[PDB]
Amino acid sequence: SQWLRKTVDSAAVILFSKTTCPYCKKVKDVLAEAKIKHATIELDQLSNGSAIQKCLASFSKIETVPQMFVRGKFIGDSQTVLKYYSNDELAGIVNESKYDYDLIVIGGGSGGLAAGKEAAKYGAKTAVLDYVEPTPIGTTWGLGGTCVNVGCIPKKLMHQAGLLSHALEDAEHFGWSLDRSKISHNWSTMVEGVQSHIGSLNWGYKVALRDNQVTYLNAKGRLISPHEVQITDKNQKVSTITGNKIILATGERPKYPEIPGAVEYGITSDDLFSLPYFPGKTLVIGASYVALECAGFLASLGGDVTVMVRSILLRGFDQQMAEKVGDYMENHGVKFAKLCVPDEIKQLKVVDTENNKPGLLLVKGHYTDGKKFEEEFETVIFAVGREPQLSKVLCETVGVKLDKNGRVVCTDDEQTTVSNVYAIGDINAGKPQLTPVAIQAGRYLARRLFAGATELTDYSNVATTVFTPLEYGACGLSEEDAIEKYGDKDIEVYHSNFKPLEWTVAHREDNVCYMKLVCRKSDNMRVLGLHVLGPNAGEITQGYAVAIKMGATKADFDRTIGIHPTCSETFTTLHVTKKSGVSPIV
Amino acid sequence: SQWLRKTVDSAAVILFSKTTCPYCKKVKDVLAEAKIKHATIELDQLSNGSAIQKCLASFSKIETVPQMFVRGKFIGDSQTVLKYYSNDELAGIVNESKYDYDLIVIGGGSGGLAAGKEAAKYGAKTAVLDYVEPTPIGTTWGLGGTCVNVGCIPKKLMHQAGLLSHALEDAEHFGWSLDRSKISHNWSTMVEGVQSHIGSLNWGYKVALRDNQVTYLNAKGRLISPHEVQITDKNQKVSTITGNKIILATGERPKYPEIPGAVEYGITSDDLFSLPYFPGKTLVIGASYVALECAGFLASLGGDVTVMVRSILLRGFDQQMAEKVGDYMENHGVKFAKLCVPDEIKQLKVVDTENNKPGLLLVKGHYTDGKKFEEEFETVIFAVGREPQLSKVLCETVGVKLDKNGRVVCTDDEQTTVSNVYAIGDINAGKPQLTPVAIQAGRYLARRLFAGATELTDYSNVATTVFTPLEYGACGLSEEDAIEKYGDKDIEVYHSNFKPLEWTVAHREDNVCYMKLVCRKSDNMRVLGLHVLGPNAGEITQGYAVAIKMGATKADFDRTIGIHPTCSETFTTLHVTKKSGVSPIV
């Protein structure tokens, strides 16, 4: 209907077909031999396919299959396409465009690369732009975005190296003869192994874009007008490229507190993952998941770590679970400067560039009680949130609407206030800032634009995992948010402590690993939120997110048989409610 | 209706109540003060509660609440119960019974202890009988059953100790300075740590039965008649105890092949987990999950291991996944004597009892091609299946029907051919032989018998995990079973290889970890079977079993956002079908 109007207008190269028709197969192999990529809509596979056939005549004047369209215009039936192919005209017909590209993606990260690769699959001439603006100290990286270079990938690899520290401790209890005195961790050796894998990913994306015929440009993009993108390369050469559809996926960069010596002497997560020297005695300022994750693995790798907290841990997360995360960290070598804020950072030593050793800094601050903070640290890491930098990316005259935070205000299909311009990932306002979210949004948007899809990205009940020393996985609402939304009387919380079987012989803690189901009483005990603290929390939580998406109830958890022995099986036998007052201990 | 007839007849002590009624609360606190345990049916919480009130008069002649029943007989209303309490008659009224116990459970294992504890909660006078018949060599254990003593618990703990072997190898790549030359495993030190935890579980169950007022009798039970159970204690003293309801939960014991020297010189999984000596050079005869699990961790702990296979691995499991399990094992130190069967076991050395060293045995066998097998092994483990031993437990004159395998033929509510006698766990014919299955069946049966529940145990789509070197988790149908059931044309299989992020820096294999979704085309692409090969497969699979229980489709997997970086997130982005012929490699 109107779907067909939007499909024809937006698709670069699309073929309307039936799977049974011989003429349709004839065109398919001709396009395959000529190496012309395209989208295919099989009308016999659709419920309203007969109605679409009738509506094609509003664009083509014919109601039969096959029907080939290029960039809003009807190209021809079976004989017409074969006419172009025999006369060697077909290549010029399919390349005919108003702009240099069908899609220009500004930002070669999680969402950007996912949108770029998916679009090229349906014959959209795609160009991806990626530029890494160096950190204050001069740290830069390759193609892949935050997650690949300075995010999930190097974070969880260092989290794993920190997990091995306690695997070495457990091994002795499990019978392994080990001299843990004379066992130390080499930071630089780990970094080299981490950066070697990131390098293969940087190279992996370059090859993938080359294989998908996507034009990769290592350049700073700037959308001067709806269709024009200004590019500045490595040589500072300035030029303009044009594109029909524009996808903004520039992401975010870490924030610095406005205090003397922060930019000059302190570092962020951007610098940490490729740091040529061991941080040593480290102060982490912030209470985000980035702050606790970074401070977590540094302490496990034998580092003297202190976390400066202004007010609370993990703002936005479940505060009962956030406390349990912090309690485990505090009991396992992580110090906390509670109710404290920094005032200034002053240098005592410059970073040893040749010996690869950290400098020395003295951090002056103050507690809420009036007491002064004055302690020396070899490395100061700032993790006080991240911000979009779209003032560098958009000229205000284009008309792309931003919120008070500087993030793009988008519709449910990622459309900006400029119709051809779209925004995905971290810069999309009000959306869960995660890697899979950006990739899902990028792929799905690319399918709607060029393949005539209707499927939108579901941003509700997106499961997360904080990779702290003891991992915390969550899917849905926090207990406090569910109570605020529906009232305390409409909320039932089933909970229980558990101990991994691995922890028993290892002589690790009882009643520390914890899980809960936040349920709505009036809605057949609907699971509103799932929360789990324990090892492999990401692997545990994932499967339940599919069930919660389908509208899982407590009864659905009860009728499902557990797998023994696992940590995740405790979700199936939950019985203790919070309202009963019965202790959740094992 | 008829539900009430069955509830009243079977329940030991039950109170029909309303949550609003003050008289009902008066009886509740009187029973709580007198420490009389009971079941409570709140009629205002039920949809048909008004209809039940009317039907109570067929048993009590009254339609009001509260109504107290003891073992099929109406005891009294609010005033009558308080009359018994004031006259000190109530204790004698609630203890009044035809038999010594309301429930006698023969078998103190997974299902048996779960059924015993749950029954006692609703005021059923319960006695659990547990006796461990020593192995041919004289190995015996405490209360808990197979899983606790010689099953899941010691299996996964030794699996973990084998997992630490490769955590030590990976640690070096993650930056840890380790001298792996001069790192060895002590078997006895591991066994002591494993048996110390099993000992706390043995003690844990004894205390739990004592706390729930369950009479534990360390005695061999024999059901001579529907209600009579003959017990033989440690002193060989023979006596008879009577019980209204009988739960058979005697489980199974490992089978021996009928060959010379098998019983005398070979051992089973029953002996392995508390073995005072290191098995050393070991031959594992069998291809079950027990066979591959035991051979898996022995090879990881530095053991020379060979597996004798008659025909195929993991019969009953997905044979594509079973091959991938075996391929990983073969590439990681596990040798396989393919198409081979044993003929005889002959002793070369007797087990060193004082030095705690293994003996020596020579195994004679033959391959299918006519070649002779003749190799020396320090330990021979038989894992050729398990069998019920109910000839020792039931006198044929009772009338309990058994199948050709010797397992109890039961209804969907676990009822035998003798109405008061029930069977749960491994001895229940045609049911998945797992620990959680037995516990679910035991708890649910105990709730139906004494608390008036209607919920039956769902035995369909029970998720499993084979804890081999590389773990394999499965939920639902195997690919070959789904094709046999619905035809090849109605089956679509989505699959992809994956690599754990942990494996990247560790320099472990690409394209070895594997997952697939077996789907039915005609049923909205319904997920019939989930299969995953990789680390933490049990934690991965569990959550999906809830979704599959709810009738998960491929679309439900697609709309669910993944968690990054995890192994389980690959299930959300599956696209490669087996029918397309596209390679599943990354």
Ligand SMILES: Cc1cc2nc3c(=O)[nH]c(=O)nc-3n(C[C@H](O)[C@H](O)[C@H](O)COP(=O)(O)OP(=O)(O)OC[C@H]3O[C@@H](n4cnc5c(N)ncnc54)[C@H](O)[C@@H]3O)c2cc1C
């Ligand atoms: C340390 C840390 C840990 C994290 N851990 C996880 C986790 O475990 N799980 C998870 O799901 N998420 C995690 N994240 C979040 C995740 O990294 C982001 O949500 C994701 O990377 C956002 O993708 P994106 O494409 O929208 O932006 P990005 O991935 O940041 O990609 C945008 C790219 O565009 C480039 N660019 C910017 N401006 C321009 C321009 N002017 N012209 C051309 N190019 C430009 C930038 O160089 C940038 O690399 C983590 C983040 C951090 C900071």
Ligand SMILES: Cc1cc2nc3c(=O)[nH]c(=O)nc-3n(C[C@H](O)[C@H](O)[C@H](O)COP(=O)(O)OP(=O)(O)OC[C@H]3O[C@@H](n4cnc5c(N)ncnc54)[C@H](O)[C@@H]3O)c2cc1C
């Ligand atoms: C090595 C191995 C590994 C396993 N791993 C797993 C796994 O990881 N996950 C999983 O889910 N399942 C696993 N299982 C299966 C699991 O152990 C069983 O399914 C479960 O224990 C069955 O419970 P049950 O109560 O029915 O029988 P049992 O647990 O065997 O309990 C029955 C008990 O009754 C006693 N008994 C027998 N006869 C009498 C009698 N005459 N009088 C009094 N007492 C008697 C026996 O001593 C026995 O201990 C494993 C099994 C083995 C062999």
